[PDB]
UniProtKB/TrEMBL annotation, chain B:
This is Uncharacterized protein. Ca(2+) 1 binds at residues 42-43, 89-90, 95. Coiled coil: none annotated. Ca(2+) 2 binds at residues 42, 89-90. The chain holds residues 35 to 155 of 642 of the full protein.
Length: 61, 121
């Protein structure tokens, strides 16, 4: 019931974008963006249509 | 240089150590650095004019059962600024805790040291 994926290294000043689109009328999931250790950085947001979850993040490290 | 000291101690489950400044100097730079030496402790440095224990305020945020994780981040930032005069970041490969503060008001101040509310899984 849990899915985790790793991403490549990001240079300073770079952005990040994610999106979830249900297909089989499945309930909207919960998506969040953390680091390797696990410290949270961003949380998903549900818009008015309720058919997509969008997350944006920028790194300064 | 002016006044540098080395402090050592142990941190329990959600318990901190209180240090009280006798008199804050005017036009002075205060540097605080804390690094964990054992365990999975996450450093956190804060200061406050009064001596009220913030364990109850921090415990309420941890006790929050809100599904959305944005509230946990927002509440932690809001409760830190509205109570602590200044605070620094927690953990990290680089400067785990390095806060610079100058208070041009004089008097006795209480610097707080403890942990934060994160996850490691």
């Amino acid at each position: 019931r849990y899915l985790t994926q790793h991403t490549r290294n990001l240079q300073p000043g770079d952005t990040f974008h994610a999106l979830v689109e249900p297909i089989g009328e499945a309930p909207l999931p919960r998506l969040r963006l953390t680091d390797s250790g696990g410290k949270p950085l961003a949380f998903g947001l549900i818009d008015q249509p309720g058919e997509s979850v969008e997350l944006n993040y920028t790194c300064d490290q | 240089e002016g006044r540098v000291q080395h402090f050592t101690g142990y941190i329990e489950d959600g318990r901190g150590i209180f240090y009280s400044l006798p008199d804050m100097k005017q036009g002075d730079i205060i540097y605080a650095s804390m690094q964990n030496t054992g365990g999975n402790l996450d450093p956190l440095v804060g200061i406050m004019a009064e001596e009220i224990d913030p364990a109850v305020s921090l415990g309420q945020v941890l006790e929050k059962a809100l599904a959305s994780e944005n509230d946990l981040i927002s509440e932690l930032t809001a409760v830190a600024d509205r109570i602590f005069l200044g605070w620094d970041d927690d953990g990290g490969k680089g400067y785990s805790a390095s806060l610079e503060f100058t208070i041009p008001r004089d008097g006795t101040y209480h610097i707080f040291a403890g942990s934060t509310i994160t996850n490691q899984r």
